[PDB]
Amino acid sequence: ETGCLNGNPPKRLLCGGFYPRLSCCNNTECGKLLEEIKCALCSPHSQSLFHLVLPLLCKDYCKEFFYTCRGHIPGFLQTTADEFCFYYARKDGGLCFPDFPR
Numbered sequence: 001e002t003g004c005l006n007g008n009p010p011k012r013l014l015c016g017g018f019y020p021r022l023s024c025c026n027n028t029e030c031g032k033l034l035e036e037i038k039c040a041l042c043s044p045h046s047q048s049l050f051h052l053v054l055p056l057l058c059k060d061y062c063k064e065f066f067y068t069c070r071g072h073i074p075g076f077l078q079t080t081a082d083e084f085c086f087y088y089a090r091k092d093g094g095l096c097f098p099d100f101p102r
Contacts, residue, residue: 003047015039018100030069040097058096062089
């Protein structure tokens with residue numbers, strides 16, 4: 001199931017706080033969330049995470065991201081969390097971002 005957005009699968013050993021052993025590679029709370037989402041490219045399931053360009057978000061994390069970054073991101077005041085997560089969160093509850101413990 002693992003796969004990088006590159007051609008080759010991940011390599012076991014820089015986003016090391018999220019994917020230390022194997023990978024593909026503001027002071028606000030929204031900034032920390034933007035760091036986490038930034039490190040989604042280095043995920044071993046990044047090819048499956050990417051099927052605003054964001055990985056398939058978990059529902060709870062999608063609500064948390066929307067409410068935490070609303071007002072800092074253009075257009076988040078122009079939509080509800082239900083529609084935003086309807087477009088960006090994964091529905092089946094399977095493999096979603098974040099795919100690391102938190």
